[PDB]
Amino acid sequence: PVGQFIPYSHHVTDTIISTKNAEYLSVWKIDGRSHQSASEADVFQWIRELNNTLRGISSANLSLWTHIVRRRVYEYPDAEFDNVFCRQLDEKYRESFTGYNLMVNDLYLTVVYRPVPDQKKHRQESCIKALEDINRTLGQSFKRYGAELLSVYEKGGHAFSAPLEFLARLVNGEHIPMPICRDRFSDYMAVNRPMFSKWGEVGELRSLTGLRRFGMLEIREYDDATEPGQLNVLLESDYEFVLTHSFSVLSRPAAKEYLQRHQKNLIDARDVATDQIEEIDEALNQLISGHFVMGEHHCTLTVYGETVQQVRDNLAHASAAMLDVAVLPKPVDLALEAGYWAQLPANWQWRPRPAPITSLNFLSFSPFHNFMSGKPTGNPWGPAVTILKTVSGTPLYFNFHASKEEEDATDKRLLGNTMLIGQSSSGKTVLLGFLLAQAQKFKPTIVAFDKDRGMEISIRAMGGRYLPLKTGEPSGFNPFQLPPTHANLIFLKQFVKKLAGEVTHRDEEEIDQAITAMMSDSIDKSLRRLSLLLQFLHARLVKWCEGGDYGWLFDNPTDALDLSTHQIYGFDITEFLDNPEARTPVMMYLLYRTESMIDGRRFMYVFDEFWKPLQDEYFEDLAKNKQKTIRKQNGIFVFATQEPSDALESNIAKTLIQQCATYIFLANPKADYEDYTQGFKLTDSEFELVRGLGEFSRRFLIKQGDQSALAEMNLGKFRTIVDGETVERDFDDELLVLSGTPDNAEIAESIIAEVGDDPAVWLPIFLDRVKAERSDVGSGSGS
Amino acid sequence: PVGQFIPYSHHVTDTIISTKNAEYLSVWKIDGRSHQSASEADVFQWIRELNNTLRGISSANLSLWTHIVRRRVYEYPDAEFDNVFCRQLDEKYRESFTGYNLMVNDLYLTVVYRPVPDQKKHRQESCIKALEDINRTLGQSFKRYGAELLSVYEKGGHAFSAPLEFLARLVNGEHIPMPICRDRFSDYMAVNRPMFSKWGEVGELRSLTGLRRFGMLEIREYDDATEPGQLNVLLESDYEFVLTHSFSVLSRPAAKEYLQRHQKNLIDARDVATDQIEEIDEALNQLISGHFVMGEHHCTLTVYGETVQQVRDNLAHASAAMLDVAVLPKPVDLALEAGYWAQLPANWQWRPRPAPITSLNFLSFSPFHNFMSGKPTGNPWGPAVTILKTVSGTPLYFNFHASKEEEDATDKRLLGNTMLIGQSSSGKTVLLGFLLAQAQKFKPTIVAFDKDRGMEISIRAMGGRYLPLKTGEPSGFNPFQLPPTHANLIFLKQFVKKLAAAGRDEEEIDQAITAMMSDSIDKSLRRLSLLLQFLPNPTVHARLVKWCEGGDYGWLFDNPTDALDLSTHQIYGFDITEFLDNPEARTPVMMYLLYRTESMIDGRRFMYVFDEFWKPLQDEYFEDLAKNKQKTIRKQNGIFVFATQEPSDALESNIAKTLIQQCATYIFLANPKADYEDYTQGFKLTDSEFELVRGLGEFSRRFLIKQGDQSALAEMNLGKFRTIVDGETVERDFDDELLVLSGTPDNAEIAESIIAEVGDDPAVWLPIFLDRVKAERSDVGSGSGS
């Protein structure tokens, strides 16, 4: 049958998996350091640190199985928006990938402990303690690597097994979420059994997504040298394959005996003393000195597909890309019937060929892969944008919340803050408008604070509120002046930031309590109450000058209910570089209102030049306490500053950098310098990349946690429906997200003054008309 | 398994590999000598020179194994052009090759020294010295044979050891690049494992690319009367075969004793086969003097294919083609298995029948005769173009980077200068355009100096500039001379070459003119106008103004700048049509053009193109800068290609003879005139190659291509149609012979139309205007006048 060939039986604890041969397993899901944004000394230092780690995690009680699974992305739920602009953008982006081969490649590392009644239970508990020590040391040496211990999807429904299903994805060919029952896992739990041909050419695998066929390659006689990332040319890899590097650790005297027999072979060659006995004696010296640790090893690449000519084509391309880098893959005959059963990490019996390798040549073969999202689908929301063009590589799946320095991981969901920095108008607002437009698939309510009349047409076409501020016109927000919790506290803050220990600090709290007790008795009084509050018990200055603050509650009604009608809200903080005269009270009560509003969804506070308005100590107290409370309770801050080396002088910017998850560096030219390496936590290669992309390349360095790569937008794509359609250029709905100020501002104002409700169906029609007039007559006629 | 049948062990030195029985191999690749160019009686002289070499290194430790491998060439890449006209020409030429005679054959020779603890190391260190001596001898003897000693290939990505890959090709069936590693080669070479069954079955070879089958033919006859090319009739056939000849040298007592045994059985005892007893006595005295060397020799023909009826058909067709040359093949039974392991050059065990033959009957059965075929890959650039219609169908794979007897040091990549010889432009311009398009395949920086408005449509459609430079139109000023880069020396040389024509060393006077000209820093047309309006204050500004003629339209001086894409292109062209000396017109404009285009690109693909190359290079400055420019530009990846209309007029000069001496690929087009003591003296042909060039004809564009020491005829043949395609609606080719051939009244009107009638940078105005050329000239042009 099939159940005798798969050795697992979960009977111990969360991370450890027992079996019938009394072995124990523990699976890690890693997404390692990117192999595109680092120097050669950095990857050499990484391999040296990993070898110094694995030198202690040794001594014959260990088997490490590194799996590199390149898999299609069937789990991605591309869905609808229920507004026509964002659905049009999703349609253009989804069919803007003309054969991009959307595959993601995750890593796994299986740690297997094998030692060689109540005493057997004691030995089992000793293996549990020993493997927990191994897992603790491995997690302490994988802090840069993003290695989540994979006993993490527990208690979903009725006790689902997370160190399982990866051991199903090897054996079934599809990620089936395994249930834990009081039974054995080898009975009939692994459902989709594969079958083999009688000659052993290509095996078949009857999954639920369709019948597949697979072929394998075994690596033998690899090169005597070892590049650190030597076999990373199989990550582009149009294969949907599974790579398995098994290293079962041999002890020191067993490895010394193996080199003794190898020297006996190389010295008793029939009159060919090939002078190769000078590096194996050096290897014996490194073994006795303790610099190495050797063990048995086999590498199997199982490439999947269908229509066996295509499987053989993939096998031939894999053999070509392997022999390019000086390893020799032999194909497999009927021993493939054992080789797939050598895929599982409890398979010393059906092991194809145990080549003894040193640990440096094992870490040099599986060091780790390029950059993707560690959770493509599975975030606290859905995946925001399937960003293409990690440059010559996989997709991105850009998320606002990925990871951070994982200390005290409990009592928090995930840090979600992002810093979308870049040079002034060099491709910042188009990316921010695109991300805020694409994020609407799981219903957030974004609140934006602009730089200078930017992102206007995007938020206005999304259905947003977007009041544009001018401070002279009476159309503006009014002081609401009715919280029945700490009206005295907000009267204190209003008095001190209206006079602008402010000036003398003499009994202003008595003025606040007097105006509260004389005016508010108790609830639901109108502009009579607001007029008493404005008049008597900005303040003295506008009271004696009559000019400069018309936009506040100066015979303006209580516009306080306007935070349940729309979803996107937008305020222009353009003419407010004169803080703390005007910018900090306005944003003080705006952030007061919009922080009293928390609707449970992702409240995305979008800032443009966040260091400009937040220049008061009240916003420092908010950037401590409110930032902790909002990044706790399903809130997301999206900053976009422009001059970060001019922003780094304030400590508010420092404490907002230190609590920010994902960074985007867009178009920083050579005018900026080595201060990206300190504060922003970069290496030298990442700053070299962001300075070497140039000025008008419109691609950005994305960095999440300890991973970094590049990303583009690719606004040139076309599709083929039956014959090859026209080139779309992604230029329809591109001037609406770029937000050129005069055309979009004038036409948006005039056609919200022409048709009443804010349209997604009628605003871009005449917006397209008024943009096409300029873009056709002004740019084609005169030459 | 198979690891006991394939006898190889580790590399011992750079070029010598080992065996599990302590034999030492060294693999040469022999780009063999071209035999269908001189095959009257010099073939016997080549065979006698090779036998006089092989008698020197007789050395009964030795065993030679030579392999003729016909391979269906797959490594020639598809040519992505990123153009429209040149891509159309590449598509038309690629569909022009349905001529099924692909399969380049390459010839290898493995020298196997078989030497019959620390003493074993001494044995190895003596066998290395002996095989290095034999390698030096065979290198000095195969100098004209295009030899290359296959070394350990020190950078593929780490180290890739490539005499081993050919040793893989005998056992695997494809060029598998075998990486050198910490394991003997007997355990990991045989990737594609063979299979054999029983009586009535040919061998199977289950490769990853597809299933293959193979049969074997064994040479077993008592034939003596051999010719030096008796088995090159298979060198044009289509089997994808591997033909192995093995010759292990018999020792002198064993050779004399077995020759005594065979002569007792043959030339004596009352039958004697009269009269075959005469050669044996003098040959026995020659063997006691060593003039013969007898050796165990066998030969197998492994014929590859698929669909075993087709393998049996190819075996029967090879049987007929070898029965044509009085050789009797035999099919191989179950000993095919052993016979397949008879191909690897360390197996004296699995040999079919080690019958002894002499050295001349081994060097005559398998000499290094080869149809000329260039490198498909491996050249430092991309391969240029394949051209068929050579000696018996096999393709050529033309390449500029072909070796020579020069390069005493291996400093540059490969010598790559080329020149065409032909009279009256008899289809020269079409060949130069057809080479320029397939050179535009791998993006070069072409600079051309055309003769009389030729190559103008090809350059203009290829993304070129093509200054007309003519003293006859209402326009014409295209020269600037304004910014100085090598100011004092080069503009001093240009001034003294512009004014110095009086019959007297005005060098310091011109130096003071340049010193008063440079006023002061970074000046424009104001500075050039100051240079024009400097006072006379003898050889003076008078002849300068009167030999620019005043309002210098055809001339170089008194111009504005023409700064428009002088460096941001890929193809530049100039004309020297109305340029002849007295007055000195052609030399300063050529000096200025070579000076400005010297430092165009230092490092990437550069190709100087010259038409009538002996015409501008006449003065002594051109000799000095030609020698220095060759010596410093051949290292900086700048190759040349010349073309002349007369051989004898080009051989009249001396610096032109120096440039002839340093070329690397000659293409002799067509000469019925054929002055005898110029082709064989200056351009270095033999007598039979010159007779070939004379008998080539006068209008057909069949040309003798000679590169290295190989020579073969070729025809580019852009006049051939086809018979089938996927879109079965049209199967004839007609175009692109009227755009590269570039008749000057067509090119003048194409330039006038691209200036005034339409206006376009790329080749997008072309095809209806090509109809406006062709159909309009055929209907209302030549035939119907008025």
Instruction: For A219-262, give the DSSP string.
Output: EES-BSS--TTTTGGGSS-TT-EEEEEEEEEP-HHHHHHHHHHH
Of A539, A558, A577, the residue at which a domain comes to its end is: A558
Q: What is the DSSP letter of B505?
A: -
**Cis peptide preceding B784, ω within 30 of 0:** no
| Beta strand ranges found along A57-210 (DSSP E) | 63-72, 103-113, 148-149, 194-195, 203-206
Distance separating alpha carbons of residues B490 and B484, to the nearest angstrom:
9
Q: Which residues contact B772 (CB under 8 A, 6 or more apart)?
A: none
Q: Based on the domain organization, do A466 and A579 belong to the same domain?
A: yes
Going by C-alpha positions, the residue among B711, B687, B38 that lies closest to residue B47 is: B38
Cα dihedral: B219, B223, B225, B226 (round 10): 0
**Distance from CA of residue B260 to its chain's centroid?**
49
On whether the CB atoms of residues A394 and A104 are closer than 8 A, the answer is yes
Distance separating alpha carbons of residues A571 and A449, to the nearest angstrom:
5
B179 and A327: CB-CB below 8 Å?
Answer: yes
Tokens 């640790």 sit on residue: A293
Distance separating alpha carbons of residues A318 and A298, to the nearest angstrom:
17
Best mutation target among B208, B209, B211, B212 (most A Cβ atoms within 10 Å) is: B208
Q: Which residues of A touch B20 (CB under 8 A)?
A: 269-270, 272
- Enter the tokens of residue A739: 């937000």
State whether residue B557 is helix, strand or coil: coil
Q: Which residues of A touch B179 (CB under 8 A)?
A: 221-223, 323, 326-328
Q: Based on the domain organization, do B603 and B643 belong to the same domain?
A: yes
The chain B residue lying nearest A326, using CA atoms, is: B179
State whether residue A25 is helix, strand or coil: strand
Partner residue opposite B21 with nearest CB, options A270, A319, A330: A270
Q: What is the DSSP letter of B106?
A: E
Question: Does A721 map to a domain?
Answer: no
The sign of the torsion formed by the CA atoms of B201, B206, B211, B212 equals: negative
Question: Does A392 map to a domain?
Answer: no
B11 and A222: CB-CB below 8 Å?
Answer: no
Question: Does B261 map to a domain?
Answer: no
Distance separating alpha carbons of residues A230 and A495, to the nearest angstrom:
67
A274 and B177: CB-CB below 8 Å?
Answer: no
Tokens 């054929």 sit on residue: B674
Cα dihedral: B129, B133, B134, B136 (round 10): 130
**Distance from CA of residue A591 to its chain's centroid?**
28
Q: Based on the domain organization, do B506 and B607 belong to the same domain?
A: no
- Enter the tokens of residue A447: 């609140």
φ, ψ at A294 (rounded to 5°) = -105, 160
- Enter the tokens of residue A70: 């390149």
**Distance from CA of residue A250 to its chain's centroid?**
38
Of B507, B527, B561, the residue at which a domain comes to its end is: B561
Distance separating alpha carbons of residues B692 and A690, to the nearest angstrom:
64
Distance separating alpha carbons of residues B648 and B688, to the nearest angstrom:
20
> How was this model experimentally determined?
cryo-EM
Partner residue opposite B208 with nearest CB, options A270, A272, A316: A316
Going by C-alpha positions, the residue among B590, B593, B595 that lies closest to residue B579 is: B590
Going by C-alpha positions, the residue among B135, B328, B357 that lies closest to residue B248 is: B357
Q: Based on the domain organization, do A116 and A254 belong to the same domain?
A: yes
- Enter the tokens of residue A729: 């250029």
Q: Based on the domain organization, do B22 and B98 belong to the same domain?
A: yes
Which contacts (CB < 8 Å, 24+ apart) does range A123-131 have? A124/A12, A124/A18, A124/A22, A127/A24, A128/A12, A128/A13, A128/A16, A128/A24, A130/A61, A131/A15, A131/A16, A131/A24, A131/A26
Q: Based on the domain organization, do A327 and A460 belong to the same domain?
A: no
In B347-473, where does DSSP find H-type helix? 360-365, 428-440, 456-461
- Enter the tokens of residue A232: 């990373």
Distance separating alpha carbons of residues B558 and B545, to the nearest angstrom:
9
Q: Based on the domain organization, do A47 and A79 belong to the same domain?
A: yes
In angstroms, the separation between the Cα of residue A393 and the nearest Cα of chain B is 22
φ, ψ at A304 (rounded to 5°) = -100, 165
What string of DSSP letters covers A697-745? S--EEEEETTEEEEE---TT-B--SSS---B-TT-TTTHHHHT-HHHHH
**Distance from CA of residue A699 to its chain's centroid?**
17
In angstroms, the separation between the Cα of residue B38 and the nearest Cα of chain A is 42
Number of Cβ atoms within 10 Å of the Cβ of B744: 14
Number of Cβ atoms within 10 Å of the Cβ of B338: 16
Question: Does B264 map to a domain?
Answer: no
In angstroms, the separation between the Cα of residue B212 and the nearest Cα of chain A is 15
Question: How far, in Å, are A271, B242, B674 from residue B186 at the CA level?
Answer: 16, 21, 57
- Enter the tokens of residue A459: 């938020």
In angstroms, the separation between the Cα of residue A462 and the nearest Cα of chain B is 42
Distance separating alpha carbons of residues B87 and B91, to the nearest angstrom:
6
Q: Letter for the amino acid at A40?
A: E
- Enter the tokens of residue B560: 């504005």
Q: Which residues of A touch B181 (CB under 8 A)?
A: 221-224, 326, 328
Taking phi over 0 as left and psi of -120 to 50 as alpha, with beta for the rest, B55 belongs to alpha
Q: Letter for the amino acid at A662?
A: T
On whether the CB atoms of residues B311 and B303 are closer than 8 A, the answer is yes
Q: Which residues of B touch A216 (CB under 8 A)?
A: none
The chain A residue lying nearest B210, using CA atoms, is: A312
Residue ranges of chain B whose CB lies within 8 Å of a chain A CB: 9-12, 18-22, 117, 120-121, 123-124, 156-160, 176-183, 187-188, 191, 208-210
Distance separating alpha carbons of residues B614 and B610, to the nearest angstrom:
9
Distance separating alpha carbons of residues B772 and B764, to the nearest angstrom:
15
Our separate counts of H helices and E strands in chain A read 24, 20
Distance separating alpha carbons of residues B547 and B471, to the nearest angstrom:
13
Question: Does A426 map to a domain?
Answer: yes
Q: Based on the domain organization, do B556 and B568 belong to the same domain?
A: no
Task: Report the run of H or E that residue B51 belongs to, with start and end.
Answer: helix B42-56
Count of domains observed in chain B: 4
- Enter the tokens of residue A93: 């982006």
Question: Does A724 map to a domain?
Answer: no
Taking phi over 0 as left and psi of -120 to 50 as alpha, with beta for the rest, A544 belongs to alpha
In angstroms, the separation between the Cα of residue A199 and the nearest Cα of chain B is 12
State whether residue B319 is helix, strand or coil: helix
State whether residue A635 is helix, strand or coil: strand
Q: Which residues of B touch A312 (CB under 8 A)?
A: 208-210
Distance separating alpha carbons of residues B54 and B294, to the nearest angstrom:
11
Ordered strands of the B638-644 beta sheet:
B571-575, B445-450, B606-610, B638-644, B418-421, B665-668, B702-707, B710-715
For residue B356, list its beta bridge partners. B296
- Enter the tokens of residue A550: 């018309």
Give the up-direction half-sphere exposure of residue A548: CA atoms within 13 A in the CB hemisphere: 15
On whether the CB atoms of residues A727 and A719 are closer than 8 A, the answer is no
> Which domain does B751 fall in, by range?
744-780
Question: Does A25 map to a domain?
Answer: yes
Task: Report the run of H or E that residue A511 belongs to, with start and end.
Answer: helix A508-519
Q: Letter for the amino acid at A27?
A: V
Of B561, B592, B623, the residue at which a domain comes to its end is: B561
- Enter the tokens of residue A42: 């950095």
Q: What is the DSSP letter of A340?
A: G
φ, ψ at A271 (rounded to 5°) = 60, 30
On whether the CB atoms of residues B379 and B370 are closer than 8 A, the answer is no
A220 and B158: CB-CB below 8 Å?
Answer: no
Q: Based on the domain organization, do B54 and B197 belong to the same domain?
A: yes
Q: Which residues of A619-632 are buried (b: 16+ CB within 10 A; e: fewer)?
A: bbebbeebbeebbe
Residue ranges of chain A whose CB lies within 8 Å of a chain B CB: 220-225, 227, 267, 269-276, 312, 315-316, 319, 323-328, 330-331
CATH code where residue A619 lies: 3.40.50.300
Tokens 């699995």 sit on residue: B350
Q: Based on the domain organization, do B491 and B626 belong to the same domain?
A: no
B179 and A319: CB-CB below 8 Å?
Answer: no
On whether the CB atoms of residues A430 and A738 are closer than 8 A, the answer is yes
Q: Based on the domain organization, do A147 and A39 belong to the same domain?
A: yes
Question: How far, in Å, are A352, A414, A415, A712 from residue A411 at the CA level?
Answer: 47, 10, 12, 35
Q: Which residues of B touch A221 (CB under 8 A)?
A: 179, 181, 183, 187-188
In angstroms, the separation between the Cα of residue B208 and the nearest Cα of chain A is 6
**Which resolution in angstroms does this entry have?**
3.4
Q: What is the largest CA-CA distance in chain A?
A: 112
Distance separating alpha carbons of residues B553 and B55, to the nearest angstrom:
72
Distance separating alpha carbons of residues A457 and A743, to the nearest angstrom:
10
Question: How far, in Å, are A298, A756, B166, B189 from residue B1 at the CA level?
Answer: 20, 85, 21, 12
Q: Which residues of B touch A783 (CB under 8 A)?
A: none
Number of Cβ atoms within 10 Å of the Cβ of A456: 25
Q: Which residues contact B749 (CB under 8 A, 6 or more apart)?
A: none
First to last CA, chain B: 85
Distance separating alpha carbons of residues B299 and B241, to the nearest angstrom:
13
B188 and A271: CB-CB below 8 Å?
Answer: no
What string of DSSP letters covers B201-218? --EEEE-SS-EEEEEEEE
Going by C-alpha positions, the residue among B616, B623, B543 that lies closest to residue B581 is: B616
Q: Based on the domain organization, do A187 and A330 belong to the same domain?
A: yes
State whether residue B65 is helix, strand or coil: strand
Question: Does A51 map to a domain?
Answer: yes
